[PDB]
Design a protein around this ligand. Structure first.
Ligand SMILES: CN(CC(=O)NCc1ccc(C(=N)N)cc1)C(=O)[C@@H](Cc1ccccc1)NS(=O)(=O)Cc1ccccc1
Ligand SMILES: *[C@@H]1O[C@H](CO)[C@@H](O)[C@H](O)[C@H]1NC(C)=O
Ligand code: NA
Ligand code: NA
Lengths: 250, 27, 11
Protein backbone atom coordinates (compact mmCIF):
# COMPACT_ATOMS: atom_id res chain seq x y z
CA UNK A 1 0.00 0.00 0.00
CA UNK A 2 1.41 3.38 -1.08
CA UNK A 3 0.61 6.57 0.87
CA UNK A 4 -1.55 4.76 3.42
CA UNK A 5 -1.28 4.32 7.17
CA UNK A 6 -0.93 1.66 9.87
CA UNK A 7 -4.13 -0.31 10.41
CA UNK A 8 -5.77 -0.23 13.82
CA UNK A 9 -5.91 -3.49 15.75
CA UNK A 10 -8.89 -5.50 14.53
CA UNK A 11 -9.70 -2.95 11.80
CA UNK A 12 -9.78 -5.54 9.03
CA UNK A 13 -10.42 -8.89 10.70
CA UNK A 14 -11.23 -10.52 7.35
CA UNK A 15 -7.74 -9.73 6.04
CA UNK A 16 -5.82 -12.86 5.06
CA UNK A 17 -2.15 -13.31 4.22
CA UNK A 18 -1.29 -15.86 1.57
CA UNK A 19 2.05 -17.23 2.67
CA UNK A 20 4.54 -19.21 0.60
CA UNK A 21 5.99 -22.18 2.53
CA UNK A 22 9.36 -22.36 0.78
CA UNK A 23 10.88 -19.88 0.64
CA UNK A 24 8.87 -18.37 3.50
CA UNK A 25 7.47 -15.11 2.11
CA UNK A 26 4.35 -13.02 1.45
CA UNK A 27 2.60 -14.13 -1.71
CA UNK A 28 -0.58 -12.06 -1.67
CA UNK A 29 -3.52 -10.78 0.28
CA UNK A 30 -6.88 -12.49 0.48
CA UNK A 31 -10.08 -12.25 2.51
CA UNK A 32 -12.14 -14.43 4.84
CA UNK A 33 -15.75 -14.86 3.65
CA UNK A 34 -16.81 -17.77 5.88
CA UNK A 35 -15.19 -20.11 8.39
CA UNK A 36 -13.92 -22.33 5.55
CA UNK A 37 -13.66 -20.10 2.46
CA UNK A 38 -11.07 -17.51 1.45
CA UNK A 39 -11.27 -15.19 -1.56
CA UNK A 40 -8.28 -13.93 -3.55
CA UNK A 41 -7.06 -12.91 -7.01
CA UNK A 42 -6.51 -15.69 -9.57
CA UNK A 43 -3.21 -14.15 -10.63
CA UNK A 44 -1.85 -14.72 -7.11
CA UNK A 45 -2.01 -18.43 -7.90
CA UNK A 46 -1.76 -18.67 -11.67
CA UNK A 47 0.14 -16.36 -14.00
CA UNK A 48 2.04 -18.21 -16.76
CA UNK A 49 3.84 -15.12 -18.11
CA UNK A 50 5.79 -14.99 -14.82
CA UNK A 51 6.03 -18.79 -14.43
CA UNK A 52 3.58 -18.65 -11.51
CA UNK A 53 1.50 -21.74 -10.81
CA UNK A 54 0.98 -22.54 -7.16
CA UNK A 55 -0.75 -25.69 -5.93
CA UNK A 56 -2.51 -26.22 -2.58
CA UNK A 57 0.54 -27.65 -0.81
CA UNK A 58 2.77 -24.69 -1.70
CA UNK A 59 0.86 -22.25 0.46
CA UNK A 60 -0.51 -21.39 3.87
CA UNK A 61 -3.28 -19.01 4.86
CA UNK A 62 -2.53 -16.76 7.85
CA UNK A 63 -5.55 -15.11 9.43
CA UNK A 64 -5.89 -12.49 12.17
CA UNK A 65 -2.53 -10.90 11.42
CA UNK A 66 -1.31 -7.36 12.00
CA UNK A 67 2.48 -7.54 11.91
CA UNK A 68 3.78 -8.47 8.46
CA UNK A 69 6.73 -10.63 9.49
CA UNK A 70 6.11 -11.68 13.13
CA UNK A 71 4.56 -14.97 14.18
CA UNK A 72 1.69 -13.51 16.19
CA UNK A 73 1.37 -16.18 18.84
CA UNK A 74 -2.13 -16.58 20.38
CA UNK A 75 -3.57 -14.16 17.82
CA UNK A 76 -3.10 -15.31 14.25
CA UNK A 77 -4.27 -18.70 13.03
CA UNK A 78 -2.57 -20.64 10.25
CA UNK A 79 -4.67 -22.79 7.91
CA UNK A 80 -3.87 -25.33 5.21
CA UNK A 81 -5.59 -25.36 1.81
CA UNK A 82 -7.92 -28.20 0.85
CA UNK A 83 -8.63 -26.98 -2.68
CA UNK A 84 -8.11 -24.01 -5.00
CA UNK A 85 -10.82 -22.91 -7.45
CA UNK A 86 -9.85 -20.50 -10.21
CA UNK A 87 -12.52 -18.86 -12.38
CA UNK A 88 -12.78 -20.99 -15.55
CA UNK A 89 -12.75 -17.85 -17.71
CA UNK A 90 -9.92 -16.06 -15.88
CA UNK A 91 -8.02 -14.22 -18.64
CA UNK A 92 -4.32 -14.35 -17.76
CA UNK A 93 -3.41 -14.04 -21.44
CA UNK A 94 -4.62 -10.48 -22.00
CA UNK A 95 -6.00 -8.25 -19.24
CA UNK A 96 -6.66 -10.27 -16.05
CA UNK A 97 -10.39 -10.32 -16.79
CA UNK A 98 -12.24 -12.26 -14.02
CA UNK A 99 -9.21 -12.15 -11.70
CA UNK A 100 -10.75 -14.21 -8.92
CA UNK A 101 -10.12 -17.45 -7.05
CA UNK A 102 -11.54 -19.26 -4.05
CA UNK A 103 -9.68 -21.38 -1.52
CA UNK A 104 -11.35 -23.91 0.74
CA UNK A 105 -9.58 -24.48 4.07
CA UNK A 106 -8.91 -27.98 5.40
CA UNK A 107 -10.51 -27.05 8.73
CA UNK A 108 -12.81 -24.22 9.81
CA UNK A 109 -11.06 -21.26 11.44
CA UNK A 110 -12.27 -20.11 14.85
CA UNK A 111 -13.53 -16.52 14.91
CA UNK A 112 -12.08 -14.09 17.43
CA UNK A 113 -11.57 -10.36 18.05
CA UNK A 114 -9.05 -10.50 15.19
CA UNK A 115 -10.72 -12.99 12.86
CA UNK A 116 -14.15 -12.40 11.31
CA UNK A 117 -15.65 -12.70 7.83
CA UNK A 118 -16.56 -9.83 5.50
CA UNK A 119 -19.92 -9.72 3.66
CA UNK A 120 -20.27 -10.24 -0.06
CA UNK A 121 -22.55 -7.72 -1.79
CA UNK A 122 -26.08 -8.31 -3.01
CA UNK A 123 -27.26 -6.58 -6.21
CA UNK A 124 -28.88 -3.74 -4.27
CA UNK A 125 -25.86 -2.95 -2.11
CA UNK A 126 -23.64 -3.10 -5.19
CA UNK A 127 -25.91 -0.77 -7.16
CA UNK A 128 -26.11 1.65 -4.23
CA UNK A 129 -22.43 1.85 -3.37
CA UNK A 130 -20.48 1.27 -6.59
CA UNK A 131 -20.68 4.88 -7.73
CA UNK A 132 -17.96 7.27 -8.85
CA UNK A 133 -16.72 9.33 -5.93
CA UNK A 134 -17.83 6.82 -3.29
CA UNK A 135 -14.82 5.68 -1.26
CA UNK A 136 -13.77 2.17 -0.35
CA UNK A 137 -10.89 0.88 1.71
CA UNK A 138 -7.92 -1.24 0.63
CA UNK A 139 -5.63 -3.12 3.01
CA UNK A 140 -2.42 -5.09 2.63
CA UNK A 141 1.20 -5.86 3.47
CA UNK A 142 2.49 -5.05 -0.01
CA UNK A 143 5.12 -2.54 -1.10
CA UNK A 144 5.06 0.99 0.32
CA UNK A 145 6.49 2.33 -2.95
CA UNK A 146 6.58 1.23 -6.58
CA UNK A 147 10.38 0.98 -6.64
CA UNK A 148 10.22 -0.85 1.28
CA UNK A 149 7.91 -3.25 3.12
CA UNK A 150 5.68 -2.28 6.08
CA UNK A 151 6.05 -3.45 9.69
CA UNK A 152 2.27 -3.86 10.00
CA UNK A 153 -0.90 -4.02 7.88
CA UNK A 154 -1.48 -0.85 5.84
CA UNK A 155 -4.80 0.84 5.06
CA UNK A 156 -5.89 3.45 2.49
CA UNK A 157 -9.29 4.88 1.55
CA UNK A 158 -9.77 5.57 -2.17
CA UNK A 159 -12.61 6.91 -4.34
CA UNK A 160 -14.20 4.87 -7.13
CA UNK A 161 -13.47 6.48 -10.49
CA UNK A 162 -15.79 7.10 -13.48
CA UNK A 163 -15.48 4.30 -16.05
CA UNK A 164 -14.47 6.59 -18.96
CA UNK A 165 -11.63 7.99 -16.85
CA UNK A 166 -10.49 4.47 -15.98
CA UNK A 167 -10.59 3.54 -19.68
CA UNK A 168 -8.74 6.69 -20.76
CA UNK A 169 -5.93 6.10 -18.23
CA UNK A 170 -4.62 2.93 -19.85
CA UNK A 171 -4.07 1.06 -23.11
CA UNK A 172 -5.24 -2.19 -21.50
CA UNK A 173 -8.76 -3.31 -22.42
CA UNK A 174 -11.05 -2.77 -19.42
CA UNK A 175 -14.10 -4.99 -18.87
CA UNK A 176 -17.34 -4.87 -16.89
CA UNK A 177 -15.68 -7.29 -14.45
CA UNK A 178 -13.29 -4.54 -13.31
CA UNK A 179 -13.56 -1.15 -11.68
CA UNK A 180 -10.87 1.36 -10.88
CA UNK A 181 -10.22 3.60 -7.90
CA UNK A 182 -7.82 6.30 -6.77
CA UNK A 183 -7.40 10.05 -6.73
CA UNK A 184 -7.00 12.22 -9.81
CA UNK A 185 -3.85 14.35 -10.18
CA UNK A 186 -5.97 17.46 -9.50
CA UNK A 187 -7.39 16.13 -6.22
CA UNK A 188 -4.17 16.47 -4.22
CA UNK A 189 -4.57 13.34 -2.08
CA UNK A 190 -3.03 10.09 -3.27
CA UNK A 191 -2.66 6.41 -2.47
CA UNK A 192 -2.81 3.05 -4.21
CA UNK A 193 -2.45 -0.66 -3.75
CA UNK A 194 0.85 -2.13 -4.93
CA UNK A 195 2.75 -5.38 -5.52
CA UNK A 196 2.02 -7.76 -2.63
CA UNK A 197 -1.43 -6.27 -1.97
CA UNK A 198 -2.94 -8.33 -4.79
CA UNK A 199 -5.82 -10.54 -3.80
CA UNK A 200 -6.70 -8.34 -0.82
CA UNK A 201 -10.08 -6.68 -0.36
CA UNK A 202 -11.55 -3.36 -1.44
CA UNK A 203 -14.33 -2.91 1.15
CA UNK A 204 -17.14 -0.41 1.75
CA UNK A 205 -19.23 0.13 4.88
CA UNK A 206 -22.91 0.15 4.00
CA UNK A 207 -24.65 3.22 5.46
CA UNK A 208 -27.91 1.24 5.38
CA UNK A 209 -26.99 -1.62 7.72
CA UNK A 210 -23.51 -0.62 8.96
CA UNK A 211 -21.87 -3.81 7.66
CA UNK A 212 -18.66 -4.08 5.69
CA UNK A 213 -18.95 -5.47 2.17
CA UNK A 214 -16.16 -6.59 -0.12
CA UNK A 215 -16.78 -4.90 -3.47
CA UNK A 216 -13.39 -5.46 -5.06
CA UNK A 217 -10.25 -7.59 -5.15
CA UNK A 218 -6.86 -5.92 -5.69
CA UNK A 219 -6.02 -6.97 -9.26
CA UNK A 220 -3.69 -4.80 -11.33
CA UNK A 221 -2.18 -1.40 -11.98
CA UNK A 222 0.54 0.22 -14.05
CA UNK A 223 3.21 0.89 -11.44
CA UNK A 224 1.88 2.12 -8.08
CA UNK A 225 0.46 5.54 -7.12
CA UNK A 226 1.44 7.10 -10.43
CA UNK A 227 -0.23 10.39 -11.35
CA UNK A 228 -2.94 9.73 -13.92
CA UNK A 229 -2.99 5.98 -13.28
CA UNK A 230 -5.55 4.10 -11.18
CA UNK A 231 -5.75 0.81 -9.35
CA UNK A 232 -7.95 -1.84 -10.93
CA UNK A 233 -10.10 -4.19 -8.90
CA UNK A 234 -12.04 -7.35 -9.66
CA UNK A 235 -15.76 -6.54 -9.52
CA UNK A 236 -16.91 -9.05 -6.88
CA UNK A 237 -20.66 -8.70 -7.39
CA UNK A 238 -20.33 -9.30 -11.15
CA UNK A 239 -18.76 -12.68 -10.38
CA UNK A 240 -20.90 -13.62 -7.36
CA UNK A 241 -22.90 -16.22 -9.33
CA UNK A 242 -19.64 -18.14 -9.87
CA UNK A 243 -18.72 -17.70 -6.20
CA UNK A 244 -22.06 -19.11 -5.10
CA UNK A 245 -21.84 -21.97 -7.61
CA UNK A 246 -18.47 -23.08 -6.20
CA UNK A 247 -19.52 -22.85 -2.56
CA UNK A 248 -22.84 -24.62 -3.34
CA UNK A 249 -21.14 -27.44 -5.26
CA UNK A 250 -18.09 -27.98 -3.04
CA UNK B 1 -25.36 -13.91 9.42
CA UNK B 2 -22.81 -11.94 11.43
CA UNK B 3 -20.67 -10.95 8.45
CA UNK B 4 -19.04 -7.55 8.21
CA UNK B 5 -19.47 -6.57 11.86
CA UNK B 6 -16.11 -6.21 13.61
CA UNK B 7 -15.71 -7.40 17.22
CA UNK B 8 -13.52 -4.43 18.16
CA UNK B 9 -15.61 -1.81 16.36
CA UNK B 10 -19.25 -2.32 15.29
CA UNK B 11 -19.88 -4.97 17.95
CA UNK B 12 -18.82 -2.48 20.66
CA UNK B 13 -20.20 0.61 18.90
CA UNK B 14 -16.68 2.01 18.42
CA UNK B 15 -15.64 3.67 15.17
CA UNK B 16 -12.23 3.42 13.58
CA UNK B 17 -10.23 6.56 12.80
CA UNK B 18 -11.17 6.97 9.14
CA UNK B 19 -14.47 5.18 8.46
CA UNK B 20 -16.26 8.54 8.65
CA UNK B 21 -14.33 9.51 5.47
CA UNK B 22 -16.14 6.67 3.70
CA UNK B 23 -19.56 7.67 5.06
CA UNK B 24 -19.08 11.28 4.01
CA UNK B 25 -18.43 10.15 0.42
CA UNK B 26 -21.70 8.21 0.22
CA UNK B 27 -23.84 11.04 -1.13
CA UNK C 1 12.75 -11.05 7.60
CA UNK C 2 9.92 -13.45 8.42
CA UNK C 3 9.87 -15.09 11.83
CA UNK C 4 9.74 -18.89 11.71
CA UNK C 5 6.30 -20.42 12.21
CA UNK C 6 5.57 -23.52 14.34
CA UNK C 7 6.68 -26.74 12.62
CA UNK C 8 3.19 -28.24 12.83
CA UNK C 9 1.99 -25.96 10.03
CA UNK C 10 4.67 -27.02 7.59
CA UNK C 11 4.16 -30.76 8.06
C1 LIG D 1 0.87 -7.84 -14.82
N1 LIG D 1 0.12 -7.00 -13.89
C2 LIG D 1 -0.56 -7.68 -12.80
C3 LIG D 1 0.03 -7.28 -11.46
O1 LIG D 1 1.23 -7.08 -11.32
N2 LIG D 1 -0.84 -7.14 -10.46
C4 LIG D 1 -0.40 -6.69 -9.15
C5 LIG D 1 -0.75 -5.25 -8.86
C6 LIG D 1 -1.87 -4.94 -8.13
C7 LIG D 1 -2.24 -3.62 -7.92
C8 LIG D 1 -1.49 -2.58 -8.44
C9 LIG D 1 -1.89 -1.17 -8.22
N3 LIG D 1 -3.03 -0.84 -7.73
N4 LIG D 1 -1.02 -0.21 -8.53
C10 LIG D 1 -0.34 -2.89 -9.17
C11 LIG D 1 0.02 -4.21 -9.37
C12 LIG D 1 0.02 -5.66 -14.00
O2 LIG D 1 -0.62 -5.02 -13.18
C13 LIG D 1 0.67 -4.94 -15.18
C14 LIG D 1 -0.40 -4.54 -16.20
C15 LIG D 1 -1.16 -5.72 -16.76
C16 LIG D 1 -2.49 -5.92 -16.43
C17 LIG D 1 -3.19 -7.01 -16.92
C18 LIG D 1 -2.56 -7.91 -17.75
C19 LIG D 1 -1.24 -7.72 -18.09
C20 LIG D 1 -0.54 -6.63 -17.60
N5 LIG D 1 1.26 -3.74 -14.60
S1 LIG D 1 2.71 -3.61 -13.90
O3 LIG D 1 3.03 -2.22 -13.85
O4 LIG D 1 3.59 -4.51 -14.59
C21 LIG D 1 2.53 -4.17 -12.21
C22 LIG D 1 3.69 -3.75 -11.34
C23 LIG D 1 3.55 -2.72 -10.43
C24 LIG D 1 4.62 -2.33 -9.64
C25 LIG D 1 5.83 -2.97 -9.75
C26 LIG D 1 5.98 -4.00 -10.65
C27 LIG D 1 4.91 -4.39 -11.45
C1 LIG E 1 -0.51 -25.46 -13.57
O1 LIG E 1 -0.34 -26.51 -12.65
C2 LIG E 1 -1.26 -27.67 -12.87
C3 LIG E 1 -0.83 -28.76 -12.02
O2 LIG E 1 0.50 -29.17 -12.14
C4 LIG E 1 -1.23 -28.13 -14.30
O3 LIG E 1 -2.12 -29.22 -14.51
C5 LIG E 1 -1.50 -27.04 -15.21
O4 LIG E 1 -1.46 -27.52 -16.56
C6 LIG E 1 -0.50 -25.97 -15.01
N1 LIG E 1 -0.62 -24.88 -15.99
C7 LIG E 1 -1.78 -23.97 -16.25
C8 LIG E 1 -3.06 -24.02 -15.50
O5 LIG E 1 -1.65 -23.13 -17.12
NA1 NA F 1 -7.68 3.62 -23.17
NA1 NA G 1 -2.70 7.51 -9.40
Amino acid sequence: IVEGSDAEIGMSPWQVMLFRKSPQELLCGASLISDRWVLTAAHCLLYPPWDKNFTENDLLVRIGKHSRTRYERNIEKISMLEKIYIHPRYNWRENLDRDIALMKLKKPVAFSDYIHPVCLPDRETAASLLQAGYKGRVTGWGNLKETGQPSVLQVVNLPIVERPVCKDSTRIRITDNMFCAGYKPDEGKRGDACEGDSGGPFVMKSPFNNRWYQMGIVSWGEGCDRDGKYGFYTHVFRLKKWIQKVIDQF
Amino acid sequence: ADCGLRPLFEKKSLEDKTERELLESYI
Amino acid sequence: DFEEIPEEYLQ
